[PDB]
Amino acid sequence: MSREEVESLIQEVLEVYPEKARKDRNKHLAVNDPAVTQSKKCIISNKKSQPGLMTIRGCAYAGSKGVVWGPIKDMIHISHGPVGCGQYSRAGRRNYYIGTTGVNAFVTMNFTSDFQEKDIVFGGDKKLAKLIDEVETLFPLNKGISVQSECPIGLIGDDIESVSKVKGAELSKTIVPVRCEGFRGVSQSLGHHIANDAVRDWVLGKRDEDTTFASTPYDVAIIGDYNIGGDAWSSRILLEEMGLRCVAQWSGDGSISEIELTPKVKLNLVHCYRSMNYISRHMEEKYGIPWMEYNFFGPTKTIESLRAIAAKFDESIQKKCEEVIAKYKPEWEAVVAKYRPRLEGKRVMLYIGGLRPRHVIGAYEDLGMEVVGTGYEFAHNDDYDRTMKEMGDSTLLYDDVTGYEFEEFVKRIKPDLIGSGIKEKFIFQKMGIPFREMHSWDYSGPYHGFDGFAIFARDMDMTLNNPCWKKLQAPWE
Amino acid sequence: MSREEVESLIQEVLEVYPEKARKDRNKHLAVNDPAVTQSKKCIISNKKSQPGLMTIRGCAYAGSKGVVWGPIKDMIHISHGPVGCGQYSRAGRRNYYIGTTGVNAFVTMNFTSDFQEKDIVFGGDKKLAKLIDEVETLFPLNKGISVQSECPIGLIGDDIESVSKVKGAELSKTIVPVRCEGFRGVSQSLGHHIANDAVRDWVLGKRDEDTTFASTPYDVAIIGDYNIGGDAWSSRILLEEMGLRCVAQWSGDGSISEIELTPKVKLNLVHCYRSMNYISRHMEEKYGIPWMEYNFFGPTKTIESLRAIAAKFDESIQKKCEEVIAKYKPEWEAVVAKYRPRLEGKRVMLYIGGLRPRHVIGAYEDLGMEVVGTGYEFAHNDDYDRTMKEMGDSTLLYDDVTGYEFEEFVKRIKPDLIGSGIKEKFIFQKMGIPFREMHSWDYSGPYHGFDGFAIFARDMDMTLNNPCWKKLQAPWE
Amino acid sequence: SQQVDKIKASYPLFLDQDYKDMLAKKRDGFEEKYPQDKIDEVFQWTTTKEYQELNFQREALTVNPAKACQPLGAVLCALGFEKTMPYVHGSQGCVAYFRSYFNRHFREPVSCVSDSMTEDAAVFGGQQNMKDGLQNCKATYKPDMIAVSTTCMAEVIGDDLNAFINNSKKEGFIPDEFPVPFAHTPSFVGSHVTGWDNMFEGIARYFTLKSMDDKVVGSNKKINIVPGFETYLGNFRVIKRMLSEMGVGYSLLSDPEEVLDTPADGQFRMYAGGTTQEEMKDAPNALNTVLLQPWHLEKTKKFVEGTWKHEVPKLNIPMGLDWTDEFLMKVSEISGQPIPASLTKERGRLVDMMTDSHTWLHGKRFALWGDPDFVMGLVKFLLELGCEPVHILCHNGNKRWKKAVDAILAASPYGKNATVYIGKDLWHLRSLVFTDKPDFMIGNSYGKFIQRDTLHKGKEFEVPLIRIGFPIFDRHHLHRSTTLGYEGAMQILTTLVNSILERLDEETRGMQATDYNHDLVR
Amino acid sequence: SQQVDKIKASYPLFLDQDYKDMLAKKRDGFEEKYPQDKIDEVFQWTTTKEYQELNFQREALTVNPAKACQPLGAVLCALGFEKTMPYVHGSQGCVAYFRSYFNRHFREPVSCVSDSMTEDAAVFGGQQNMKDGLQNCKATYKPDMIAVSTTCMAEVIGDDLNAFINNSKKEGFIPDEFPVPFAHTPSFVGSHVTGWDNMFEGIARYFTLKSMDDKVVGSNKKINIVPGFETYLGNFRVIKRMLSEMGVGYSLLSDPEEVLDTPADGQFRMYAGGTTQEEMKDAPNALNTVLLQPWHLEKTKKFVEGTWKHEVPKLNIPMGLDWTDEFLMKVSEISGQPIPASLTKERGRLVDMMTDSHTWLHGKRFALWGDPDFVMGLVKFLLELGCEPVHILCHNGNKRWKKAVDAILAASPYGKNATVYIGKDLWHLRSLVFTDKPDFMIGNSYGKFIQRDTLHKGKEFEVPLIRIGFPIFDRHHLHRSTTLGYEGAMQILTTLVNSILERLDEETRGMQATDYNHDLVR
Ligand code: ICS
Ligand code: CLF
Ligand code: CLF
Ligand SMILES: [Fe+3]
Ligand SMILES: [Fe+3]
Numbered sequence A, B: 001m002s003r004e005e006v007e008s009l010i011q012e013v014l015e016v017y018p019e020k021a022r023k024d025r026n027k028h029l030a031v032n033d034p035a036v037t038q039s040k041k042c043i044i045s046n047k048k049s050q051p052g053l054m055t056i057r058g059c060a061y062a063g064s065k066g067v068v069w070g071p072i073k074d075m076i077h078i079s080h081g082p083v084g085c086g087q088y089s090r091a092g093r094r095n096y097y098i099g100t101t102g103v104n105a106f107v108t109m110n111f112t113s114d115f116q117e118k119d120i121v122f123g124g125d126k127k128l129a130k131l132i133d134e135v136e137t138l139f140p141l142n143k144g145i146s147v148q149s150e151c152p153i154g155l156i157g158d159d160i161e162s163v164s165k166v167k168g169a170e171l172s173k174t175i176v177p178v179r180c181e182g183f184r185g186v187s188q189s190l191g192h193h194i195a196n197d198a199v200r201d202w203v204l205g206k207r208d209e210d211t212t213f214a215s216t217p218y219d220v221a222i223i224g225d226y227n228i229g230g231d232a233w234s235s236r237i238l239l240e241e242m243g244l245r246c247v248a249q250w251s252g253d254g255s256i257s258e259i260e261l262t263p264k265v266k267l268n269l270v271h272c273y274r275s276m277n278y279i280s281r282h283m284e285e286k287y288g289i290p291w292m293e294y295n296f297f298g299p300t301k302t303i304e305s306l307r308a309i310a311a312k313f314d315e316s317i318q319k320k321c322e323e324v325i326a327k328y329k330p331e332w333e334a335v336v337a338k339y340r341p342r343l344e345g346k347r348v349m350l351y352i353g354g355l356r357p358r359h360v361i362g363a364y365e366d367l368g369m370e371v372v373g374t375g376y377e378f379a380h381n382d383d384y385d386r387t388m389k390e391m392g393d394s395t396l397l398y399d400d401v402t403g404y405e406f407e408e409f410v411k412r413i414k415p416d417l418i419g420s421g422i423k424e425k426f427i428f429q430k431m432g433i434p435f436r437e438m439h440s441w442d443y444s445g446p447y448h449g450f451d452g453f454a455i456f457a458r459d460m461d462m463t464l465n466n467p468c469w470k471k472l473q474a475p476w477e
Numbered sequence C, D: 001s002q003q004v005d006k007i008k009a010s011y012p013l014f015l016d017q018d019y020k021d022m023l024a025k026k027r028d029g030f031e032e033k034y035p036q037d038k039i040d041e042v043f044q045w046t047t048t049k050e051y052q053e054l055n056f057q058r059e060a061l062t063v064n065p066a067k068a069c070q071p072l073g074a075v076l077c078a079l080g081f082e083k084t085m086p087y088v089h090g091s092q093g094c095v096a097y098f099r100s101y102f103n104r105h106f107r108e109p110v111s112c113v114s115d116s117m118t119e120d121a122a123v124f125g126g127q128q129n130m131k132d133g134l135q136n137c138k139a140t141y142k143p144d145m146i147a148v149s150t151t152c153m154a155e156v157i158g159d160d161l162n163a164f165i166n167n168s169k170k171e172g173f174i175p176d177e178f179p180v181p182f183a184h185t186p187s188f189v190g191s192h193v194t195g196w197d198n199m200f201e202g203i204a205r206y207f208t209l210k211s212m213d214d215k216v217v218g219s220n221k222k223i224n225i226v227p228g229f230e231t232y233l234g235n236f237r238v239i240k241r242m243l244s245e246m247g248v249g250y251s252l253l254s255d256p257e258e259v260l261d262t263p264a265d266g267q268f269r270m271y272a273g274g275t276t277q278e279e280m281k282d283a284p285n286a287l288n289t290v291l292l293q294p295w296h297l298e299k300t301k302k303f304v305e306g307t308w309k310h311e312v313p314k315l316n317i318p319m320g321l322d323w324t325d326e327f328l329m330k331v332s333e334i335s336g337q338p339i340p341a342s343l344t345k346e347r348g349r350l351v352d353m354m355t356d357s358h359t360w361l362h363g364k365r366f367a368l369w370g371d372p373d374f375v376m377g378l379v380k381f382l383l384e385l386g387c388e389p390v391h392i393l394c395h396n397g398n399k400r401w402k403k404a405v406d407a408i409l410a411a412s413p414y415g416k417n418a419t420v421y422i423g424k425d426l427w428h429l430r431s432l433v434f435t436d437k438p439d440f441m442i443g444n445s446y447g448k449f450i451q452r453d454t455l456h457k458g459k460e461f462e463v464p465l466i467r468i469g470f471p472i473f474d475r476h477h478l479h480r481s482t483t484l485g486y487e488g489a490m491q492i493l494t495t496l497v498n499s500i501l502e503r504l505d506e507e508t509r510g511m512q513a514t515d516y517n518h519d520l521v522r
Helices: A003-014 A019-026 A060-069 A084-088 A117-122 A125-138 A151-155 A160-171 A188-202 A231-241 A256-260 A273-287 A299-310 A315-343 A361-365 A381-390 A403-413 A422-430 A449-464 B003-014 B019-026 B060-069 B084-088 B117-122 B125-138 B160-171 B188-204 B231-241 B256-260 B273-287 B299-311 B315-343 B361-366 B381-388 B403-413 B422-430 B449-464 B467-471 C017-030 C036-045 C049-056 C070-078 C092-106 C119-124 C127-141 C152-157 C161-170 C192-214 C233-246 C277-285 C298-308 C320-335 C341-361 C372-385 C399-410 C426-435 C445-457 C485-507 D017-031 D036-046 D049-056 D070-079 D092-106 D119-124 D127-141 D152-156 D161-170 D192-214 D233-245 D277-285 D298-308 D320-335 D341-361 D372-384 D399-410 D426-435 D445-457 D485-507
Strands: A029-031 A076-080 A145-149 A175-178 A219-223 A245-250 A267-270 A291-293 A347-350 A370-376 A396-399 A417-420 A435-437 B029-031 B076-080 B145-149 B175-178 B219-223 B245-250 B267-270 B291-293 B347-350 B370-376 B396-399 B417-420 B435-437 C084-089 C145-150 C223-226 C250-252 C288-291 C365-369 C388-394 C419-422 C440-443 C465-467 D084-089 D145-150 D223-226 D250-252 D288-291 D365-369 D388-394 D419-422 D440-443 D465-467
Touching (some): A019 C127, A060 A076, A060 A084, A060 A175, A060 A273, A060 C092, A076 A125, A084 C070, A084 C092, A125 A145, A125 C049, A145 A160, A175 A188, A219 A231, A231 A245, A231 A299, A231 A315, A231 A449, A231 C017, A245 C017, A267 A273, A273 A291, A273 A381, A299 A315, A299 A449, A315 A449, A347 A403, A361 A370, A361 A449, A370 A403, A381 A396, A396 A403, A403 A422, A417 A449, A422 A435, A422 C092, B003 B019, B003 B396, B003 B403, B019 D127, B060 B076, B060 B084, B060 B145, B060 B175, B060 B188, B060 B273, B060 D092, B084 D092, B125 B160, B125 D049, B145 B160, B160 B175, B175 B188, B188 B256, B219 B231, B219 B273, B231 B245, B231 B299, B231 B449, B245 B256, B256 D017, B267 B273, B299 B315, B299 B449, B315 B449, B361 B370, B361 B449, B370 B381, B370 B403, B381 B396, B403 B422, B403 D127, B417 B422, B417 B449, B422 B435, B422 D092, B435 B449, B449 C341, B467 C341, B467 C372, C036 C445, C070 C145, C070 C192, C084 C092, C084 C127, C127 C161, C145 C152, C145 C161, C145 C192, C223 C233, C223 C320, C233 C250, C233 C341, C233 C485, C250 C277, C277 C298, C288 C298, C288 C320, C320 C372, C320 C485, C365 C426, C372 C388, C388 C399, C388 C426, C419 C426, C426 C445, C440 C445, C440 C485, C445 C465, C465 C485, D036 D049, D049 D426, D070 D084, D070 D145, D084 D092, D084 D127, D119 D127, D127 D145, D145 D161, D145 D192, D192 D277, D233 D250, D233 D341, D233 D485, D288 D320, D320 D341, D320 D372, D341 D485, D365 D372, D365 D426, D372 D388, D372 D485, D388 D399, D388 D426, D426 D445, D440 D485, D445 D465
Parallel strands (some): A076 A145, A145 A175, A219 A245, A219 A267, A267 A291, A347 A370, A370 A396, B076 B145, B219 B245, B219 B267, B267 B291, B347 B370, B370 B396, B417 B435, C223 C250, C223 C288, C365 C388, C365 C440, D084 D145, D223 D250, D223 D288, D365 D388, D365 D440, D388 D419
Antiparallel strands (some): A029 A396, B029 B396
16 A cells, blocks of 8 residues: 555545544544654644544553552552442453462452442541551551552542551551542553652652662663563563673562662663653652663564663673573574564554554564554654654554544555454454454463564464464355 | 052053063062062062063173173283173273272273174184283283173184183283173173182182281181272271271272182171172182171161171170270261151162162161162072061062063152162153162262261262252143 | 474463572562561461451451442443444543453453543533534444443532433534433442443333333233343343243343354444344333343332333242243243243253252352342252352342342251352452362352462362353353353253362372272263 | 261272271282382383384284274164164173163163073074064054164174064064164174164165155255264254254254153153154155265165165265355255355354464364264364364274375364374373373263373373263263354364363462463453
8 A cells, every 4th residue: 555545544534523523533643754753743642532432542540550550569559449440450461470469469459449429428538547457457468558549539539648648657558649540631641650650759769768788780670561471571581691680670570679679770671661761760860870761572672672781881791692692593593484484474553552562563573574554542752753763654653543443444454463452352353354462462472582572473373374264254155 | 558559560560561571570570478488489580581671681791791800900801802892881880999090900991802803704712812912011010811701702612711721821820711701691690600610710729729828817808899989998997997807808999819818718708699609609618718698788787797797706806896886886876867867758669780679778777768669680589588588568579670660660659769770760860759879879989887878878868858859840730 | 492393471481490590589689578488377367267257347448349330231231222332421441441341251342432531521521522422423433322321430520411411412413313311320339230220221211201101011912021231142042042932022122142242254343233222112012021130120120110010020030940930930921822842841851950960969069159130040049959059249239139048048958058248259258268168169250369279278178160150251252151041050050060070080080099989980 | 987967978088097097908918019119110111102102013902992882873873763662683781781871971761672682592593582572572662663783692693684573573473564674783893883874774775665666856855864873962953953044844864862851850751752754754755865974874875875866965074164164055055045144143153253262272282082973073173273183083983084084184284293093092092192292182081091191190291181072971961062063163162262271270370380370361
């Protein structure tokens, strides 16, 4: 398809809308041009959703509890409000961890204040205070409590900050208030922000006066890898084989102690810029700790990123970097030799949240596949900036894509593979298009590092070339 | 019903037969009398089955392979002939054992010469001989081999005896030929006899000239407990707490060595007269070893048999007998206190093989129940002798009962419970009559000794009083 | 490391020596973890009678709920009408979760829209969201009807749905006669089954309240069937099948079976099947209305009795043997059609199965949970089988329901060891299966984590999960099953006996130790 | 000892310390058992490649067969006809075993008689038994037809079935007109499936050979369906249901589904349902005859083509997707009825489940066995699912069959690690699952012993059994399942994917070891 056919497709799709939504949606749909290297010049992002168009977006609570806070394994997180939010988000996200659940770790459990009508009327602050005490009795090895606000908390005028301060002092315990009510902002994105501000104000400082931690020149932190299917452990093994010491890793398989030790490190390695740039900037200004983005998705990006990381230290680390590279070279070369022939020339459309739509492009390229359309749920313009340069000319870009748009684009572009979320999966499968989940990894993974690339290639292959796709037409039709 | 009502029942049932089958079956059905004992005063047995009437009876291979030889655990038993016999009898009978199956024990395996048409034409002897070498190679820890003849072996003139001697000497191994072809005799019974003679002729005498076995005044053998559901182990424990040493126990959980040590004991305790009396009389004749029958079915019988066994020895065994009786007293009285109220008054009809139809009466009586009919597949007149004094006046007796007869008797007598075999079970369940399998114990047991009585009672209760029985009639009928 | 020819996913990959050592250093260096001895000691304590007492003293904290919120059920109710778009007035985050909660249970697309209320609507109300939302929805996905429910944001701010929808029509955003039934569905009242009831009652009102004058009870010669919140496709099917076998004219009100089970044949179908608007308008002309799950269909019953004048019969959910009998006999009496030979035979086939499996079922002890109607049906069937339901937990149950279950229990000797718990959660149930250990759990996927904890204490303490309920996320296609009727009873019996036999096989598989009882025939 | 309130059966009773010690003393005292070190060492050896070579060298010894003998199949075939008593001329022992074997699988009565031939008849022939037997059977159990097969004794001595039956009629033991079809069913040729074939052909010949002159192909507008040896009730039901949905007239020749699934309603029915004699007489008037399991219906085929002149079409067993499609398409061509909307949809539902479950099914390795038509259909479906059938075993299969299966394997990349074995037994299969380990076995209850052996080597070596086939004795009511058609493919898929996920659950249940991958959602 040519530029003119895409642009034509865009206006064709907008026809169905009433004028108000039409005009807004036009601004969120663009064709990429390598001639303009500046996000705004092409597309608009991080605006309100148009009502009733079937956006794929979640809320600020999903961004704060589901994404940033929930993975922290040795704290108890309370879904404070009515029963729904905590239930639907119980163990739906694969932020993997090591611990003894119900005893020292609490990730896949659902703790809630389960609001009734009386708590709407009189407020829930007295119930929150009692809940905190019941939690200390029943879960004595918890090392901290967060309070994740659902929609009604802010709307009835509760003061969870006051309950948290008074109860924190009484019990000599960290209780973190989080105002991540789902009506706040436009998407999961503001939830990230509020949750980073909460880490900052209530946890990250706890050890500013302590000098006992013995440091080394090679201390780093892995910030914003949520360890989907083990993703962070496959990234971590490579940093440790390269001679760095990973003092902290959060929030996937993250402990509160390692959040509190993060200000001790020499470099913050940031996997997800969108969710964690707020805290990373705060740490540079307050502690003089630099940060850098990196990508361990596919061998090309992994290799480039190891080199860039190594480059921030001395010769000895750069040496180990080249040894790690030589070690895994045969393994990834074999994955390529086996799977690239089976995937070469096939065309992929992506739709994910705030990072993966650009971050996974390199891995597809290492298998000789072409990303012909990508898009984000809740990215900002600095994200679209990095995207336009990683995507080919005349590719489609879509922001806060509606159900209708995504289905009509696909019908016309006819990609060979789609990578999106659970809400999209069963749609395109029915239309005969191979589909892979690019949040949950379809219950597979890891996809990070050299070990994850293997898994990643097997998965794309098993699905794209599955014999089920030849069977959708009954032979008598 | 009075005697007369049963008498006329037998006549009504017989009217359907043609004359020849009518006259025969009259002789196999009778009513029990208050004075007249000696069987041949009132019923005939151990005759041919009338063709086409659906006898429940099996064959001489069943009696020999499935019953006597099959349970012997450290030997390999060959179903010699075509494929069916060994397949249908593979692990149908729960003769429990301790061992490592396929390595040093082989009970639930099916070894066969799987006759093809070439073996009918040329005979099976060369195949048999090759088959034995293959067994020695593949199962080197077998301690002997038996050859269980199926129907065609005798009919085509094979000489298994000669193969067995020649290969026996060539390989220094015990190889037992058994002529238990299914066309011999009229039932499982002849299979018992043939199997006992083969034991006599080929195994029992192996240690006649050996004197190394260190004997005691208290050595016994348990003969003809096949350990169904562990029956034999529940009897054994009682004999040993009484201070006896059970040197041999066969066939259930029986090893070939224990068979060979049986001539060294002081007393043969025979569970099943019908199947093992032949070898029992031969051992008294040849070695001077006495035998007695015993019954550990229900507390009444168990107590009386423990006393009778103890009486054959000195005062120290008699004292231990009383300690065993006193120890188990509270246990079995608690089974009675609990289940007798739930079973008191209920009426039972039985049909089984050669022993249990009379042997289980006492246990039912211990639970307040009444046996209003019993009969045997393949009993002899001495079995019926012992049976008439155990059954009430005016009860029904049936030998080689036909499918028609059993159904019709039951319709008219309306017992509360039937205890029979798998071929009978689902017929009576459909007629809304609670049914317990009294060969297999319905996958339960043991039913022997005091521990067995607990299970037997639970089992009659769970089935007799089950809520399902009230539900057969749809409420709109 | 990977061997390219035998690639390892997370399991068993992180069991490789190099990962295990790396994981150990993470923990020892920087996680400041409680010692293993203390972890073990606290675990043991959480299994005790002492801890169960503290646990059942909770008033403020809920741990691991066995319920969801109203609007989830409203959506599922709305999914059951012809070409209908469920539409939740409020915040969009709720909608993403509703859809993905159902996607994972049915392995199917789920269509639902929000009108994306934000902080601005928090101040000024959601009026504009409704107007633009309805117009955008109608034009974009071309539904024949939009069924409006609410999230808790919109309940708290007090948005007037009726006015908001009327204004939307008055100002020309959707056509005047375009159907927009609505219901208030507050997440802080009752539960998801309550949302199902509120939505249904709002839809029945929309199509019938103002056209009542020409209606005559019985003039269409049909019986209305309201299924309630239902996530087994077989339960819809079996009810239709049985009524078709009796030759009973009927009308299933809210029927999502088609839209939740479309073919993968090359096209995506947003809408399929479902109760037509004509069937909802004509529903008052039926002989009567039968509620399949009455303990969550109370508001619907008040409406049907008060406005339609149907004498809704006192029938329990048709689960197990006696209550499928009663259901068929009531339908026979209402319709004047006899129960036919086919269903009499199907019944006796169920009883045959009960006769064949009663020895293994007898005295087997169960903990179980779910919605009120489903739980009482399961309890009832367990008693009919000779099983003992020892822990019966219904988080969204009420005191009147519990009294009805206690009466059911008292009428059978098999109920003597049973206790009913309402308002309790799966952390309460965890204690129960440690201190008064049953043989199995019957429940949804959340129970796999209770089975894990039991096994951590030791193999002898493990209580296996049998998956019956909603949601089931960790097996595939069980949502096709049936729990109602004779068919459903047959499927449950089979599943229960084979779970017991499977477990006995596991316990008897040790060679020369336990395999004396490893029987070929059971 | 027993505690009266908590009674123990054999498991776990004999684990009590006093029983253990007793068992120890028995062993050490008098069993003269090989030491435990030697047992371990021989076990290890039986799992090796060395032992496997020896095992596959056997010529004379068969161990743990996966087949039975002809007359078993003759009996099942006969039970499929209206008020028909099966009758096996020869020894009664055979008959006690046929009935038990089937009782235990179907958990139902199974009616069959012998004429009880003994040593007398070995020498003078069974003529007298046959005369008395036919007269006694007719009078006592009042069948409308008696169908005669033979045990190996009657074959070896050359009893003339034909003459014996004629004389019984001549000499007035049963009426001339009374139906008594017969077949020679020697146990020393083929297997149970061969007996089904022989018996069916004998029944078809009886009713049609002498009356061909008034017959016109097509005149009755039906298709004959011959199921072959079939022990899932769901497979008779699905075939009927699909043809009824198509509006195709058909005649199921041998239909035992009613007599093997009677109601438990207070009476025993010896006979129920079954193909009528009028249907067998009229069968030559059909358009054609379809054989559902052609690889054991060769003799039946030749009769049908040679005498009835139907052009029996070349169709595989309708299992899995392509072959169910091909079956339906062929039936449409012959009948002139279009494939209807309902079945098109059902197909697409199957395809949807395939798309939903492909990720867990992909690459999974299976050892399997059974009868030849069932085995090849399971093989086909497995390839369609993206599974790898590595050990394919058919003890009663032949060279020609093997070649066709090899060709099915070569048409798919998923076939490349597959080997087909014929004439081999479950002891051969045991070696295979040690030396080239699959993930699962698909087979009958005899496989449980192979699973046991594998676990004994170690947990990592265990190969779990998935029970599909015959006989199944150690689970309840699985005989009601379906394996043909789309319905059957739906059941097999669900079972296969859930067995995979259940195993993954078991491997990931260890807390703080493997539970990182114990996902709620799969
Ligand atoms: S051996 Fe006999 S038929 Fe005495 S052939 Fe039979 S395990 Fe029966 S009544 Mo099955 S003479 Fe044993 C018997 Fe009794 S197989 Fe068992 S139950 S006590
Ligand atoms: S945007 Fe708000 S914080 Fe986000 S997910 Fe929605 S409530 Fe929660 Fe919860 S209980 Fe249910 S799902 Fe809601 S309607 Fe109230
Ligand atoms: S009385 Fe004879 S020894 Fe007894 S069980 Fe019958 S054959 Fe066997 Fe075997 S193979 Fe089959 S089952 Fe037979 S017809 Fe031949
Ligand atoms: Fe689906
Ligand atoms: Fe049955």
